[PDB]
Amino acid sequence: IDDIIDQEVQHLSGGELQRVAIVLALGIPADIYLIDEPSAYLDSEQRIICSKVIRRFILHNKKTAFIVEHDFIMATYLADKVIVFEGIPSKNAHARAPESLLTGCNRFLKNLNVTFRRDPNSFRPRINKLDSQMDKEQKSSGNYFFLDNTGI
Amino acid sequence: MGGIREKKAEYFAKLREYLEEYKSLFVVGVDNVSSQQMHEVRKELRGRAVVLMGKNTMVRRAIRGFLSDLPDFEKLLPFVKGNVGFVFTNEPLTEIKNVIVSNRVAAPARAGAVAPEDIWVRAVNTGMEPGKTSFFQALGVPTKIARGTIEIVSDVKVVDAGNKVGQSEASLLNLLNISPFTFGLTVVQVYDNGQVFPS
Amino acid sequence: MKYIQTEQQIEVPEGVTVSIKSRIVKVVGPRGTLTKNLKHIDVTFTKVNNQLIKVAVHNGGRKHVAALRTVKSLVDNMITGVTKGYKYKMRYVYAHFPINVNIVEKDGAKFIEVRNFLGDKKIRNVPVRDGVTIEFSTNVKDEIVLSGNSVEDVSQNAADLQQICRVRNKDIRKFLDGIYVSHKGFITEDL
Amino acid sequence: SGNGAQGTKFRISLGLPVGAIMNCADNSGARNLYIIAVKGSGSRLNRLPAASLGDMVMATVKKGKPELRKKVMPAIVVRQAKSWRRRDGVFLYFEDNAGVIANPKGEMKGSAITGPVGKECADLWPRVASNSGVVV
RNA sequence: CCGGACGGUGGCCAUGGAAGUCGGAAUCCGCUAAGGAGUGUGUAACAACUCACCGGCGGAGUAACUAUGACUCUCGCCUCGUCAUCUAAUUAAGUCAAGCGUUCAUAGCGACAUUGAUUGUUCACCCACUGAACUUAGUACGAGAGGAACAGUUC
Known about the structure:
Chain D: Keywords: Acetylation, Cytoplasm, Methylation, Ribonucleoprotein, Ribosomal protein. In chain B, 29% of the residues lie in helices and 21% in strands.
């Protein structure tokens, strides 16, 4: 940014501008902070820097934050509750009250119908194909994702 | 440096003859003024006629008075203040004040000192780069960053006459390079010929 | 060598009456009232006039006499606390981890609750003493303010808080995190 | 255990005291491993230190490529034989004692592991997971 | 408790640079109440602090190289040996303060002086282990190099 310092914002770049904006919101004190889609224009390292940012400050400062996101992993790290939206795009929509991470994730992922079993090595979501026995078994359990938690 | 006088009654004795030698006797305030400034001020006086010593050894104008017939006792309330001298002179009263009071030596204010007159800070660019602008704001000097420099928004009075200047207030003003008062021998009184003049 | 008498003055001001029997002091003024027990010492209090009270020690040693001034002072600060009152200010200090300080209550409680101290996974609590009130100063950043009639209770309540935030296992000159006492004064202003 | 062991390990019956020789079950060139020390083991007069499943030992290679013989290196126990008991209530045992040569951090020297591998070891040493076929 | 702490001048020689403050002696002058050619803190080097001192308040020689010694001349202790080989492994309190500590006597130190193999092995010498691990955290501090803990968890 030292080099960016003199540069104009019109002259600037996309991803660089994004990290700067997220930081700026955090720049000032507020009871509640609101961020909308921080993942845009950012690559892997860049987003994950952001994930650490929101979680750490909020925890520390004891303030609240709402973050909108498309990225699965970013939501998981930062949040404690989730709101899922449904309906049909460009027509109508609906919002829900906040619900626990497990609860909210099942609802959202149920709309998609892709399960992300777990990869034992990576601990990564592993996608599950449609009509299946293993995937079918999960549908009866209610587990879209897995983590270092108890569960079948 | 050793114990030997450090005189008592001896320096008083020189001082005795000094009020009596000269017509005009001044009660004067060094406290504020630096000593290149005092010592220079005194250089002026010294050619004309000279200044001498005391504590309470000064207050003993009474003995001098007792020798002659002039005051006691009788004076209004003995005006002496912290940091007082006596100026014995040929020089008439009115002129002595114009030398001393008009020609004071520059100098900057001080922290915890009572301001003698109104203090203002001007608007314009300080010329200083971004940093702790906040310190200025704390005093009640508005500042904001314009053109990547710290600038003072407006002229305003930081402190009034008769109010003390805060420790933060003083330091920040010195960095600005803003000073402004006149230091010297603050005249606190005159005797001439049976008559008492206050400031 | 034993000094035959040494005495002290405790000056009394317009709004207060102080009453002493055995060596039990009751000072009562505009701000409420304070009482302290001086039996552990051996001095003789004597009234001269509604605005004056003396304390004296007869035939005392160094150490006895030394305790006589400290009696004067002790009863002075009872008198001033009942007039001007006492206000200690403290400020939070941290390099990274913002120290979050609240006031909670479990069972008529009042505690000063310190979260996040250096990231610290433990939640610190210091109980508010009686006779002492706590305001988080508006207009100032991370300043807590303890006030009341008893310098001793304000001062100690203050030190309880600062000491609950000592750092361990770090260079305490680099890791200066804490809540330090920053200003000792009075409740009534101008003075 | 120790370095590079992400995870804790629930106690399991000690199978292999010092002096024990297990099969080398990698493709490193080593034929066996002779246990001379268990890491993280404690002290009691007269007790042999003794390893178990997913313990890191210190071994020498008694049988194997000469470039591996005559020296001490880290290994990890992968199969037991002394029966032990899991928290699901089961008493289980392998047919052989066997471990794999490894580095202090916990990286396999070899690239395969031949035979099965108990889960408690797999769970303990990721690069062991990688190279394992049938687990448990 | 606080104000004042000043001119000759940054004395003089040594001086790389030493303007009071590593150093060699010498201690003056004017000032004025009193202000040391300068107590200690000194940026290299002034400052900038300060303080004193006025004040407000049986033994040897020998060398076209070291060593050895063809030649001339004269009457298993040390040892657990060294190299291999077999082992993962192998006997198979305090005072004084001159000094150091680059600047400083005492942070840290202080002269003088003074009040499982191998073995009977003990021992000794290796080979290994480990209060530890995990997150706290590669964090706070640090130009980096590097590097914490309190909380919670499992042994």
